[PDB]
Short mmCIF file of N, CA, C and O and ligand atoms in Angstrom, two decimals:
data_model
loop_
_atom_site.label_atom_id
_atom_site.label_comp_id
_atom_site.label_asym_id
_atom_site.label_seq_id
_atom_site.Cartn_x
_atom_site.Cartn_y
_atom_site.Cartn_z
N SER A 1 0.18 6.86 -8.32
CA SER A 1 -0.89 5.89 -8.60
C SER A 1 -0.35 4.45 -8.64
O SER A 1 0.87 4.23 -8.70
N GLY A 2 -1.27 3.49 -8.53
CA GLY A 2 -0.95 2.07 -8.59
C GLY A 2 -1.91 1.20 -7.83
O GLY A 2 -2.52 1.64 -6.85
N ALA A 3 -2.03 -0.05 -8.23
CA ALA A 3 -2.89 -1.02 -7.54
C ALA A 3 -2.32 -2.41 -7.58
O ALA A 3 -1.45 -2.71 -8.44
N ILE A 4 -2.81 -3.31 -6.69
CA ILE A 4 -2.49 -4.72 -6.68
C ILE A 4 -3.74 -5.46 -7.21
O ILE A 4 -4.87 -5.17 -6.79
N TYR A 5 -3.55 -6.43 -8.13
CA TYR A 5 -4.66 -7.23 -8.67
C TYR A 5 -4.46 -8.69 -8.31
O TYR A 5 -3.56 -9.32 -8.87
N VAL A 6 -5.21 -9.23 -7.36
CA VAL A 6 -5.08 -10.61 -6.88
C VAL A 6 -6.44 -11.26 -6.89
O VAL A 6 -7.42 -10.68 -6.38
N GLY A 7 -6.58 -12.41 -7.56
CA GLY A 7 -7.89 -13.06 -7.69
C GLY A 7 -8.92 -12.12 -8.27
O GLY A 7 -8.61 -11.40 -9.23
N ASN A 8 -10.09 -11.99 -7.63
CA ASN A 8 -11.08 -11.01 -8.08
C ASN A 8 -11.10 -9.78 -7.20
O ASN A 8 -12.17 -9.19 -6.99
N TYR A 9 -9.92 -9.35 -6.75
CA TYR A 9 -9.79 -8.16 -5.90
C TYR A 9 -8.81 -7.14 -6.49
O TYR A 9 -7.83 -7.51 -7.16
N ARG A 10 -9.10 -5.86 -6.25
CA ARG A 10 -8.25 -4.71 -6.60
C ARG A 10 -7.91 -3.97 -5.30
O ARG A 10 -8.83 -3.50 -4.62
N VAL A 11 -6.62 -3.83 -4.98
CA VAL A 11 -6.21 -3.15 -3.74
C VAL A 11 -5.58 -1.80 -4.13
O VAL A 11 -4.59 -1.78 -4.90
N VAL A 12 -6.10 -0.69 -3.58
CA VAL A 12 -5.59 0.64 -3.89
C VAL A 12 -5.40 1.48 -2.59
O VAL A 12 -5.93 1.11 -1.54
N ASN A 13 -4.72 2.65 -2.68
CA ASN A 13 -4.68 3.57 -1.54
C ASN A 13 -6.12 4.09 -1.41
O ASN A 13 -6.77 4.47 -2.43
N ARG A 14 -6.63 4.11 -0.17
CA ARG A 14 -8.04 4.55 0.04
C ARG A 14 -8.25 5.97 -0.52
O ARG A 14 -9.29 6.23 -1.16
N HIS A 15 -7.26 6.86 -0.34
CA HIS A 15 -7.38 8.24 -0.83
C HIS A 15 -7.38 8.35 -2.33
O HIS A 15 -7.85 9.37 -2.84
N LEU A 16 -6.96 7.30 -3.08
CA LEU A 16 -7.01 7.32 -4.55
C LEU A 16 -8.14 6.47 -5.15
O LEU A 16 -8.21 6.33 -6.38
N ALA A 17 -9.02 5.87 -4.29
CA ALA A 17 -10.10 5.04 -4.84
C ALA A 17 -11.07 5.82 -5.72
O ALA A 17 -11.35 6.98 -5.46
N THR A 18 -11.58 5.16 -6.78
CA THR A 18 -12.54 5.77 -7.71
C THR A 18 -14.00 5.53 -7.29
O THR A 18 -14.27 4.70 -6.40
N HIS A 19 -14.94 6.16 -7.99
CA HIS A 19 -16.37 5.97 -7.82
C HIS A 19 -16.73 4.47 -7.94
O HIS A 19 -17.48 3.95 -7.10
N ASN A 20 -16.14 3.79 -8.93
CA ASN A 20 -16.36 2.36 -9.18
C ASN A 20 -15.85 1.53 -8.01
O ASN A 20 -16.52 0.58 -7.61
N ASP A 21 -14.66 1.86 -7.45
CA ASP A 21 -14.15 1.10 -6.32
C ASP A 21 -15.12 1.20 -5.12
O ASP A 21 -15.35 0.19 -4.46
N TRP A 22 -15.64 2.39 -4.81
CA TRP A 22 -16.57 2.54 -3.68
C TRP A 22 -17.92 1.80 -3.95
O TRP A 22 -18.44 1.20 -3.00
N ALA A 23 -18.40 1.81 -5.20
CA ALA A 23 -19.64 1.09 -5.57
C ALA A 23 -19.45 -0.43 -5.48
O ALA A 23 -20.40 -1.16 -5.20
N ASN A 24 -18.21 -0.92 -5.70
CA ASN A 24 -17.90 -2.35 -5.64
C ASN A 24 -16.98 -2.65 -4.45
O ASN A 24 -16.13 -3.55 -4.52
N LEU A 25 -17.18 -1.91 -3.34
CA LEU A 25 -16.35 -2.01 -2.13
C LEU A 25 -16.45 -3.39 -1.48
O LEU A 25 -17.55 -3.90 -1.28
N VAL A 26 -15.28 -3.96 -1.12
CA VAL A 26 -15.22 -5.19 -0.33
C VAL A 26 -14.85 -4.83 1.13
O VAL A 26 -15.50 -5.28 2.08
N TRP A 27 -13.78 -4.04 1.32
CA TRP A 27 -13.28 -3.67 2.64
C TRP A 27 -12.44 -2.38 2.53
O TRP A 27 -11.76 -2.17 1.53
N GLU A 28 -12.50 -1.50 3.54
CA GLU A 28 -11.66 -0.30 3.57
C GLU A 28 -11.36 0.08 5.02
O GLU A 28 -12.13 -0.21 5.94
N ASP A 29 -10.19 0.71 5.23
CA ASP A 29 -9.79 1.13 6.57
C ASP A 29 -9.01 2.45 6.41
O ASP A 29 -7.88 2.46 5.90
N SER A 30 -9.60 3.57 6.86
CA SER A 30 -9.01 4.91 6.81
C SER A 30 -7.68 4.94 7.58
O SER A 30 -6.71 5.57 7.12
N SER A 31 -7.65 4.26 8.76
CA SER A 31 -6.42 4.26 9.57
C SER A 31 -5.27 3.52 8.87
O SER A 31 -4.14 3.75 9.23
N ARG A 32 -5.54 2.70 7.85
CA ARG A 32 -4.48 2.01 7.09
C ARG A 32 -4.22 2.66 5.72
O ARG A 32 -3.32 2.23 4.98
N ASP A 33 -5.10 3.60 5.29
CA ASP A 33 -5.04 4.18 3.94
C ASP A 33 -5.23 3.08 2.85
O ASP A 33 -4.65 3.19 1.76
N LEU A 34 -6.06 2.01 3.13
CA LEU A 34 -6.32 0.96 2.14
C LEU A 34 -7.81 0.83 1.80
O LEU A 34 -8.68 1.00 2.67
N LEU A 35 -8.06 0.36 0.57
CA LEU A 35 -9.39 0.04 0.07
C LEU A 35 -9.27 -1.14 -0.90
O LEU A 35 -8.31 -1.20 -1.71
N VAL A 36 -10.19 -2.13 -0.77
CA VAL A 36 -10.22 -3.27 -1.68
C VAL A 36 -11.61 -3.28 -2.33
O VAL A 36 -12.63 -3.16 -1.64
N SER A 37 -11.63 -3.45 -3.65
CA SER A 37 -12.87 -3.52 -4.43
C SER A 37 -12.87 -4.80 -5.26
O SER A 37 -11.82 -5.40 -5.49
N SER A 38 -14.06 -5.24 -5.70
CA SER A 38 -14.17 -6.47 -6.48
C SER A 38 -13.94 -6.20 -7.97
O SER A 38 -14.17 -5.09 -8.44
N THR A 39 -13.45 -7.20 -8.72
CA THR A 39 -13.19 -7.07 -10.15
C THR A 39 -13.92 -8.18 -10.92
O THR A 39 -14.24 -9.23 -10.35
N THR A 40 -14.11 -7.98 -12.23
CA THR A 40 -14.74 -8.99 -13.07
C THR A 40 -13.69 -9.96 -13.63
O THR A 40 -13.97 -11.14 -13.80
N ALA A 41 -12.49 -9.46 -13.91
CA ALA A 41 -11.42 -10.28 -14.45
C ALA A 41 -10.45 -10.72 -13.37
O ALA A 41 -10.30 -10.04 -12.35
N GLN A 42 -9.78 -11.85 -13.59
CA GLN A 42 -8.81 -12.38 -12.66
C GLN A 42 -7.49 -11.61 -12.73
O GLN A 42 -7.01 -11.30 -13.82
N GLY A 43 -6.93 -11.31 -11.56
CA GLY A 43 -5.62 -10.66 -11.47
C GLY A 43 -4.48 -11.65 -11.44
O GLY A 43 -4.70 -12.85 -11.21
N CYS A 44 -3.25 -11.15 -11.63
CA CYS A 44 -2.07 -12.01 -11.71
C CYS A 44 -1.06 -11.80 -10.62
O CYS A 44 0.01 -12.43 -10.68
N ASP A 45 -1.31 -10.90 -9.66
CA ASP A 45 -0.32 -10.64 -8.61
C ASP A 45 -0.44 -11.72 -7.49
O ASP A 45 -1.50 -12.33 -7.31
N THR A 46 0.67 -11.99 -6.79
CA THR A 46 0.66 -12.93 -5.66
C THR A 46 1.03 -12.10 -4.41
O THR A 46 1.98 -11.34 -4.48
N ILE A 47 0.29 -12.25 -3.31
CA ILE A 47 0.60 -11.53 -2.08
C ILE A 47 1.63 -12.35 -1.30
O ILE A 47 1.45 -13.57 -1.11
N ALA A 48 2.67 -11.70 -0.79
CA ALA A 48 3.66 -12.37 0.05
C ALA A 48 2.99 -12.77 1.38
O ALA A 48 2.16 -12.03 1.92
N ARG A 49 3.37 -13.93 1.94
CA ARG A 49 2.90 -14.38 3.25
C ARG A 49 4.21 -14.72 3.96
O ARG A 49 4.73 -15.84 3.85
N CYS A 50 4.74 -13.76 4.70
CA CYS A 50 6.09 -13.83 5.23
C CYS A 50 6.36 -12.67 6.22
O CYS A 50 5.49 -11.80 6.41
N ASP A 51 7.56 -12.63 6.81
CA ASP A 51 7.95 -11.52 7.68
C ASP A 51 9.20 -10.80 7.12
O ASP A 51 9.92 -10.18 7.91
N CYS A 52 9.47 -10.89 5.78
CA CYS A 52 10.62 -10.21 5.11
C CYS A 52 10.72 -8.75 5.54
O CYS A 52 9.70 -8.08 5.78
N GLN A 53 11.96 -8.28 5.65
CA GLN A 53 12.27 -6.88 5.93
C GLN A 53 13.20 -6.30 4.85
O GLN A 53 13.78 -5.24 5.08
N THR A 54 13.39 -7.01 3.70
CA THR A 54 14.12 -6.48 2.55
C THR A 54 13.28 -6.76 1.29
O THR A 54 12.55 -7.74 1.23
N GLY A 55 13.36 -5.83 0.34
CA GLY A 55 12.62 -5.92 -0.92
C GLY A 55 13.00 -4.81 -1.87
O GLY A 55 14.06 -4.21 -1.73
N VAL A 56 12.18 -4.62 -2.89
CA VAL A 56 12.39 -3.59 -3.91
C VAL A 56 11.07 -2.84 -4.09
O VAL A 56 10.01 -3.46 -4.11
N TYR A 57 11.14 -1.49 -4.25
CA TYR A 57 9.90 -0.74 -4.52
C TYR A 57 10.04 0.14 -5.73
O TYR A 57 11.13 0.56 -6.05
N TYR A 58 8.90 0.41 -6.38
CA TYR A 58 8.90 1.32 -7.54
C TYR A 58 8.62 2.74 -7.08
O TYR A 58 7.55 3.00 -6.50
N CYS A 59 9.50 3.68 -7.52
CA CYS A 59 9.40 5.10 -7.24
C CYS A 59 9.14 5.85 -8.58
O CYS A 59 10.06 6.06 -9.36
N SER A 60 7.88 6.21 -8.85
CA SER A 60 7.53 6.90 -10.10
C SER A 60 8.22 8.25 -10.27
O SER A 60 8.51 8.64 -11.41
N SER A 61 8.47 8.99 -9.16
CA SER A 61 9.13 10.31 -9.26
C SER A 61 10.63 10.20 -9.61
O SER A 61 11.27 11.23 -9.84
N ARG A 62 11.18 8.99 -9.67
CA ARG A 62 12.56 8.77 -10.12
C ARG A 62 12.62 7.78 -11.30
O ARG A 62 13.72 7.49 -11.81
N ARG A 63 11.46 7.20 -11.73
CA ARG A 63 11.40 6.11 -12.74
C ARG A 63 12.43 5.02 -12.37
O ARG A 63 13.19 4.56 -13.22
N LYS A 64 12.47 4.62 -11.08
CA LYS A 64 13.50 3.69 -10.61
C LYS A 64 12.93 2.72 -9.60
O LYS A 64 12.01 3.08 -8.85
N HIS A 65 13.50 1.53 -9.54
CA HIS A 65 13.12 0.48 -8.57
C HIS A 65 14.29 0.39 -7.58
O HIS A 65 15.44 0.08 -7.97
N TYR A 66 14.02 0.70 -6.32
CA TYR A 66 15.07 0.75 -5.32
C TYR A 66 15.04 -0.45 -4.34
O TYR A 66 14.01 -0.72 -3.73
N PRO A 67 16.21 -1.06 -4.11
CA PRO A 67 16.29 -2.13 -3.08
C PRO A 67 16.29 -1.44 -1.70
O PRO A 67 17.05 -0.48 -1.52
N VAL A 68 15.50 -1.95 -0.75
CA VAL A 68 15.40 -1.31 0.56
C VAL A 68 15.29 -2.33 1.68
O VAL A 68 14.79 -3.43 1.50
N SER A 69 15.70 -1.89 2.90
CA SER A 69 15.40 -2.55 4.17
C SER A 69 14.23 -1.75 4.77
O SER A 69 14.20 -0.54 4.64
N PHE A 70 13.24 -2.43 5.33
CA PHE A 70 12.06 -1.72 5.86
C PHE A 70 11.67 -2.26 7.20
O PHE A 70 11.95 -3.41 7.53
N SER A 71 10.96 -1.43 7.99
CA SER A 71 10.57 -1.82 9.33
C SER A 71 9.34 -2.75 9.37
O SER A 71 8.69 -2.91 8.35
N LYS A 72 9.02 -3.41 10.52
CA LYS A 72 7.82 -4.26 10.59
C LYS A 72 6.57 -3.37 10.70
O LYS A 72 6.65 -2.27 11.27
N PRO A 73 5.40 -3.87 10.25
CA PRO A 73 4.18 -3.03 10.29
C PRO A 73 3.87 -2.51 11.69
O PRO A 73 3.85 -3.29 12.65
N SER A 74 3.66 -1.19 11.81
CA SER A 74 3.46 -0.56 13.10
C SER A 74 2.48 0.63 13.05
O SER A 74 2.03 1.03 11.97
N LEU A 75 2.18 1.21 14.22
CA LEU A 75 1.32 2.37 14.36
C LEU A 75 2.28 3.57 14.40
O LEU A 75 3.14 3.67 15.31
N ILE A 76 2.19 4.43 13.38
CA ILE A 76 3.13 5.54 13.19
C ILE A 76 2.41 6.87 12.99
O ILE A 76 1.39 6.91 12.30
N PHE A 77 2.90 7.95 13.63
CA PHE A 77 2.27 9.25 13.46
C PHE A 77 2.60 9.80 12.05
O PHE A 77 3.77 9.77 11.62
N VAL A 78 1.54 10.22 11.31
CA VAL A 78 1.68 10.76 9.97
C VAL A 78 1.15 12.19 9.95
O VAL A 78 -0.01 12.42 10.31
N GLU A 79 1.97 13.15 9.49
CA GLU A 79 1.56 14.55 9.42
C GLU A 79 0.35 14.82 8.51
O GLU A 79 0.09 14.06 7.58
N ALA A 80 -0.34 15.97 8.72
CA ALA A 80 -1.47 16.34 7.87
C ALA A 80 -1.04 16.47 6.40
O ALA A 80 0.09 16.87 6.10
N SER A 81 -1.94 16.07 5.51
CA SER A 81 -1.73 16.11 4.07
C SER A 81 -3.00 16.67 3.38
O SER A 81 -3.94 17.08 4.05
N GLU A 82 -3.05 16.61 2.04
CA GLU A 82 -4.23 17.01 1.29
C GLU A 82 -5.43 16.09 1.56
O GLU A 82 -6.57 16.53 1.43
N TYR A 83 -5.19 14.82 1.97
CA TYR A 83 -6.27 13.84 2.12
C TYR A 83 -6.64 13.38 3.54
O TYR A 83 -7.71 12.80 3.71
N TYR A 84 -5.80 13.63 4.54
CA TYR A 84 -6.12 13.28 5.93
C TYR A 84 -5.56 14.35 6.86
O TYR A 84 -4.45 14.85 6.62
N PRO A 85 -6.23 14.63 7.99
CA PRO A 85 -5.57 15.44 9.02
C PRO A 85 -4.44 14.63 9.70
O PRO A 85 -4.31 13.41 9.48
N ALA A 86 -3.64 15.26 10.57
CA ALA A 86 -2.58 14.55 11.29
C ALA A 86 -3.19 13.44 12.14
O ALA A 86 -4.21 13.67 12.81
N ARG A 87 -2.65 12.22 12.04
CA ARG A 87 -3.23 11.08 12.75
C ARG A 87 -2.21 9.95 12.83
O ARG A 87 -1.18 10.00 12.13
N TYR A 88 -2.52 8.88 13.58
CA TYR A 88 -1.70 7.69 13.55
C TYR A 88 -2.23 6.76 12.46
O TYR A 88 -3.43 6.48 12.38
N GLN A 89 -1.29 6.25 11.63
CA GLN A 89 -1.63 5.28 10.58
C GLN A 89 -1.10 3.92 11.05
O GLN A 89 0.06 3.82 11.50
N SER A 90 -1.95 2.89 10.99
CA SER A 90 -1.60 1.54 11.42
C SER A 90 -1.09 0.67 10.24
O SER A 90 -1.28 1.02 9.06
N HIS A 91 -0.39 -0.44 10.59
CA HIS A 91 0.15 -1.39 9.62
C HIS A 91 1.10 -0.69 8.63
O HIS A 91 1.16 -1.12 7.48
N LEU A 92 1.89 0.30 9.10
CA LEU A 92 2.78 1.07 8.21
C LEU A 92 4.25 0.63 8.40
O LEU A 92 4.68 0.40 9.54
N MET A 93 5.01 0.51 7.29
CA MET A 93 6.42 0.12 7.36
C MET A 93 7.24 1.26 6.77
O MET A 93 6.84 1.79 5.73
N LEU A 94 8.39 1.63 7.38
CA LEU A 94 9.21 2.72 6.83
C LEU A 94 10.55 2.17 6.30
O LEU A 94 11.08 1.19 6.82
N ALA A 95 11.09 2.88 5.34
CA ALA A 95 12.43 2.64 4.79
C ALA A 95 13.08 3.99 4.46
O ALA A 95 12.38 5.02 4.36
N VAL A 96 14.41 4.00 4.39
CA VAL A 96 15.12 5.17 3.94
C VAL A 96 15.08 5.17 2.42
O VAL A 96 15.65 4.28 1.75
N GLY A 97 14.39 6.16 1.88
CA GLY A 97 14.25 6.25 0.43
C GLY A 97 13.41 7.44 0.01
O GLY A 97 12.87 8.15 0.86
N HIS A 98 13.29 7.64 -1.32
CA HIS A 98 12.57 8.79 -1.84
C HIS A 98 11.08 8.53 -2.09
O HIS A 98 10.74 7.50 -2.63
N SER A 99 10.20 9.46 -1.74
CA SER A 99 8.76 9.35 -1.91
C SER A 99 8.14 10.74 -2.06
O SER A 99 8.44 11.61 -1.26
N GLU A 100 7.24 10.93 -3.06
CA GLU A 100 6.41 12.14 -3.25
C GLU A 100 4.96 11.68 -3.30
O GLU A 100 4.70 10.49 -3.53
N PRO A 101 3.97 12.56 -3.01
CA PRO A 101 2.57 12.09 -2.96
C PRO A 101 2.11 11.23 -4.14
O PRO A 101 1.45 10.22 -3.93
N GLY A 102 2.46 11.62 -5.37
CA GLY A 102 2.06 10.86 -6.55
C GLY A 102 2.74 9.51 -6.69
O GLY A 102 2.36 8.73 -7.56
N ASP A 103 3.73 9.21 -5.84
CA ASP A 103 4.34 7.87 -5.79
C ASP A 103 3.45 6.86 -5.06
O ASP A 103 3.72 5.66 -5.16
N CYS A 104 2.38 7.31 -4.35
CA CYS A 104 1.49 6.36 -3.66
C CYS A 104 0.93 5.36 -4.65
O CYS A 104 0.48 5.75 -5.73
N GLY A 105 0.87 4.08 -4.26
CA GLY A 105 0.41 3.04 -5.17
C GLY A 105 1.56 2.20 -5.70
O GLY A 105 1.34 1.09 -6.24
N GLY A 106 2.80 2.73 -5.65
CA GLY A 106 3.97 1.97 -6.11
C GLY A 106 4.12 0.70 -5.26
O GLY A 106 4.00 0.75 -4.04
N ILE A 107 4.38 -0.45 -5.92
CA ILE A 107 4.47 -1.70 -5.17
C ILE A 107 5.83 -1.90 -4.51
O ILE A 107 6.87 -1.63 -5.14
N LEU A 108 5.79 -2.50 -3.28
CA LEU A 108 6.99 -3.02 -2.60
C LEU A 108 6.83 -4.55 -2.69
O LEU A 108 5.77 -5.10 -2.35
N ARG A 109 7.90 -5.21 -3.18
CA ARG A 109 7.87 -6.66 -3.28
C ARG A 109 9.11 -7.32 -2.77
O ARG A 109 10.20 -6.75 -2.72
N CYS A 110 8.90 -8.52 -2.25
CA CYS A 110 10.01 -9.37 -1.77
C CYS A 110 10.04 -10.66 -2.63
O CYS A 110 9.22 -10.83 -3.55
N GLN A 111 10.93 -11.62 -2.27
CA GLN A 111 10.97 -12.90 -2.99
C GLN A 111 9.65 -13.68 -2.94
O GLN A 111 9.44 -14.53 -3.80
N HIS A 112 8.74 -13.37 -1.99
CA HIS A 112 7.47 -14.11 -1.83
C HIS A 112 6.27 -13.48 -2.56
O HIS A 112 5.20 -14.11 -2.69
N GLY A 113 6.44 -12.25 -3.03
CA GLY A 113 5.35 -11.56 -3.71
C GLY A 113 5.21 -10.13 -3.25
O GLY A 113 6.17 -9.52 -2.77
N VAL A 114 4.00 -9.58 -3.43
CA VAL A 114 3.68 -8.20 -3.04
C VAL A 114 3.56 -8.07 -1.56
O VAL A 114 2.83 -8.83 -0.91
N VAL A 115 4.35 -7.13 -0.98
CA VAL A 115 4.32 -6.83 0.46
C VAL A 115 3.34 -5.70 0.80
O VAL A 115 2.69 -5.72 1.83
N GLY A 116 3.33 -4.64 -0.02
CA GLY A 116 2.48 -3.48 0.23
C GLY A 116 2.62 -2.42 -0.84
O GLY A 116 3.21 -2.68 -1.89
N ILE A 117 2.03 -1.27 -0.60
CA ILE A 117 2.10 -0.15 -1.55
C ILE A 117 2.56 1.12 -0.86
O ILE A 117 2.25 1.36 0.30
N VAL A 118 3.23 2.02 -1.63
CA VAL A 118 3.68 3.30 -1.07
C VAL A 118 2.44 4.08 -0.58
O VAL A 118 1.40 4.11 -1.27
N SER A 119 2.55 4.66 0.60
CA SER A 119 1.41 5.39 1.23
C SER A 119 1.84 6.69 1.86
O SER A 119 1.00 7.62 1.93
N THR A 120 3.10 6.79 2.36
CA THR A 120 3.59 8.01 3.04
C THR A 120 5.02 8.40 2.59
O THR A 120 5.70 7.62 1.89
N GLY A 121 5.47 9.57 3.02
CA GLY A 121 6.82 10.01 2.72
C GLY A 121 7.15 11.30 3.43
O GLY A 121 6.29 11.99 3.98
N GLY A 122 8.40 11.66 3.31
CA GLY A 122 8.90 12.92 3.84
C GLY A 122 10.17 12.70 4.61
O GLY A 122 10.36 11.62 5.17
N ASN A 123 11.03 13.72 4.66
CA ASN A 123 12.26 13.66 5.46
C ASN A 123 13.23 12.54 5.03
O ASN A 123 14.00 12.04 5.85
N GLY A 124 13.20 12.15 3.76
CA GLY A 124 14.07 11.08 3.28
C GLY A 124 13.62 9.67 3.66
O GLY A 124 14.38 8.71 3.53
N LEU A 125 12.36 9.55 4.05
CA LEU A 125 11.76 8.29 4.41
C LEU A 125 10.62 8.00 3.42
O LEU A 125 10.01 8.93 2.87
N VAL A 126 10.33 6.72 3.24
CA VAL A 126 9.18 6.29 2.43
C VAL A 126 8.40 5.28 3.28
O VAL A 126 9.01 4.44 3.95
N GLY A 127 7.07 5.40 3.28
CA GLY A 127 6.26 4.47 4.07
C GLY A 127 5.36 3.64 3.18
O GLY A 127 4.82 4.13 2.21
N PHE A 128 5.17 2.38 3.56
CA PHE A 128 4.35 1.43 2.79
C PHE A 128 3.25 0.86 3.66
O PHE A 128 3.51 0.41 4.80
N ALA A 129 2.00 0.82 3.09
CA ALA A 129 0.90 0.17 3.77
C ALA A 129 1.05 -1.34 3.54
O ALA A 129 1.03 -1.80 2.39
N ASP A 130 1.14 -2.15 4.63
CA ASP A 130 1.28 -3.61 4.51
C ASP A 130 -0.03 -4.23 4.07
O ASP A 130 -1.10 -3.78 4.51
N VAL A 131 0.05 -5.31 3.26
CA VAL A 131 -1.13 -6.12 2.86
C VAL A 131 -0.95 -7.62 3.22
O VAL A 131 -1.87 -8.41 2.98
N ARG A 132 0.24 -8.04 3.73
CA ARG A 132 0.53 -9.44 4.03
C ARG A 132 -0.37 -10.08 5.07
O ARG A 132 -0.43 -11.32 5.12
N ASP A 133 -1.05 -9.28 5.92
CA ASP A 133 -1.93 -9.87 6.93
C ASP A 133 -3.38 -10.08 6.39
O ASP A 133 -4.21 -10.69 7.09
N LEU A 134 -3.69 -9.60 5.19
CA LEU A 134 -5.05 -9.70 4.63
C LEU A 134 -5.16 -11.06 3.93
O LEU A 134 -5.07 -11.18 2.70
N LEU A 135 -5.27 -12.12 4.76
CA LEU A 135 -5.21 -13.49 4.26
C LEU A 135 -6.34 -13.84 3.33
O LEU A 135 -6.16 -14.68 2.44
N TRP A 136 -7.49 -13.20 3.52
CA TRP A 136 -8.66 -13.44 2.70
C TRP A 136 -8.45 -13.02 1.24
O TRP A 136 -9.22 -13.43 0.38
N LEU A 137 -7.41 -12.20 0.93
CA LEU A 137 -7.13 -11.83 -0.46
C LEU A 137 -6.76 -13.11 -1.26
O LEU A 137 -6.92 -13.11 -2.47
N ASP A 138 -6.28 -14.20 -0.60
CA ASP A 138 -5.87 -15.45 -1.27
C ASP A 138 -7.03 -16.39 -1.56
O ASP A 138 -6.79 -17.45 -2.12
N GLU A 139 -8.28 -16.05 -1.15
CA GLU A 139 -9.41 -16.95 -1.38
C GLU A 139 -10.72 -16.22 -1.71
O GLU A 139 -10.87 -15.04 -1.38
N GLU A 140 -11.69 -16.93 -2.32
CA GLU A 140 -13.04 -16.44 -2.70
C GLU A 140 -13.08 -14.96 -3.13
O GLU A 140 -14.12 -14.46 -3.57
N1 LIG B 1 -1.18 7.81 3.93
C1 LIG B 1 -1.34 9.13 4.03
O1 LIG B 1 -1.68 9.69 5.08
C2 LIG B 1 -0.99 9.93 2.78
C3 LIG B 1 -2.22 10.59 2.15
C4 LIG B 1 -1.84 11.35 0.88
C5 LIG B 1 -0.56 12.14 0.93
O2 LIG B 1 -0.35 13.04 0.11
N2 LIG B 1 0.29 11.89 1.96
C6 LIG B 1 1.52 12.68 2.08
C7 LIG B 1 2.71 12.09 1.36
C8 LIG B 1 2.67 10.86 0.72
C9 LIG B 1 3.78 10.37 0.03
C10 LIG B 1 4.93 11.14 -0.05
C11 LIG B 1 4.99 12.36 0.61
C12 LIG B 1 3.90 12.83 1.32
O3 LIG B 1 4.11 14.04 1.93
C13 LIG B 1 5.50 14.42 1.66
C14 LIG B 1 6.09 13.39 0.69
C15 LIG B 1 0.07 10.98 3.10
ZN1 ZN B 2 8.88 -12.23 1.79
#
């Protein structure tokens, strides 16, 4: 689990969104595994606006924050899971590291702010859904 809180927006993994998130939906994309909903209170997170390929992510299944090198956002084949059939997921970045399904939502951050959230894993790899291209998260 986990979310990003920026301005009056809440960013979560689409597969973990609640009834309230869908009722207050701003934008969602199944191919990215992302959903953004509106909030009443102001958030305190800052979204990175950069092309960084190094950062730190939180891994709940190890209670640890790991420094990682990660790939640029791309279209990557993701195996079938409990929440989606086998498909290509877009805007996905991979790193060598540990990930289990319940780790989804863990933040990846660089010196500029939040880069994305954990979304995939397996085979000693961890994948993150990028949010740095969602420029509208910085306004209204
Ligand atoms: N973005 C997706 O398609 C998600 C949907 C929910 C989900 O359980 N997975 C599989 C998954 C995620 C993280 C870690 C691991 C996983 O499988 C093995 C280790 C993929
Ligand atoms: Zn950065």
